């Protein structure tokens with residue numbers, strides 16, 4: 001049967017946490033199938049249903065600067081690297097669910113925060129009062145799973161299907177960063193008082209939530225030139241949202257005000273110190289073989305410090 005294979009440099013570097021999937025959009029589906037096949041098996045999904053699923057998922061990501069199809073596949077590769085470094089820790093259903101959740105986690109993102117949708121009074125803000133975009137992404141995921149010929153989970157029992165859709169729902173909701181701060185504190189406490197227990201389902205759920213935040217933020221774990229150019233896309237969105245806040249008669253927060261372009265380096269410091277480093281530190285305590293993500297994060301913080309010192 002039909003293995004996907006990658007050129008040599010990608011075959012070796014895809015295994016590393018800091019891999020960048022590259023600028024050739026047409027290779028991203030093959031990269032994803034490659035990662036399914038190694039992390040899950042050639043048996044996990046029917047190739048034709050999987051291919052069809054991946055292509056409808058792509059079609060439902062919008063042409064926005066950051067929250068686009070490249071982000072989806074990027075977050076899926078970080079999950080691949082976590083799963084492959086922690087072979088025996090995860091169930092077969094988790095292996096199945098988590099790469100799908102990662103590919104799907106920002107489906108139909110419009111380039112605006114939950115907060116902007118609430119202030120604009122978008123219909124989605126009435127349908128979903130918290131984690132607005134994330135409930136939308138999970139909804140789009142179910143929609144695409146229900147298209148004819150798209151049920152990649154059709155070989156699972158009813159109860160196994162319900163479990164996988166529940167891993168996916170929780171993994172996608174956990175990407176709402178408003179939820180991360182508390183998830184991470186609870187995990188920091190359970191790990192330190194030694195109550196953390198991977199047989200407890202509500203504990204796995206938290207650990208998979210943190211994994212989701214870690215994959216989602218994985219821009220900060222790349223080689224410096226990747227990190228730095230990705231920040232440009234991240235701000236291109238924030239600043240467009242800022243413009244849209246000013247159109248509603250609202251001062252955006254500094255993060256979203258393009259008049260604060262000059263403070264970016266200091267904004268990245270606060271973000272590495274308040275969000276990124278805590279994220280990868282707690283993740284490395286729970287899952288020691290994820291340490292290269294923390295190391296890469298720390299290398300990038302120290303590059304932002306250099307930019308501030310005028311050394312860059």
Ligand SMILES: Cc1nc2c(S(C)(=O)=O)cc(CCc3nc(N4CCCC4)nn3C)nn2c1C
Nearest residue numbers: 177217219220234254255260263264267268271
């Ligand atoms: C992967 C990645 N995720 C993010 C996010 S997130 C997870 O919210 O999506 C936010 C940020 C912006 C952080 C920030 N910038 C500023 N300023 C800009 C100039 C004035 C103030 N303040 N703050 C807090 N960066 N980022 C990165 C590199």
Ligand SMILES: [Mg+2]
Nearest residue numbers: 105106133175
């Ligand atoms: Mg999101």
Ligand SMILES: [Zn+2]
Nearest residue numbers: 105106175216
């Ligand atoms: Zn995302």
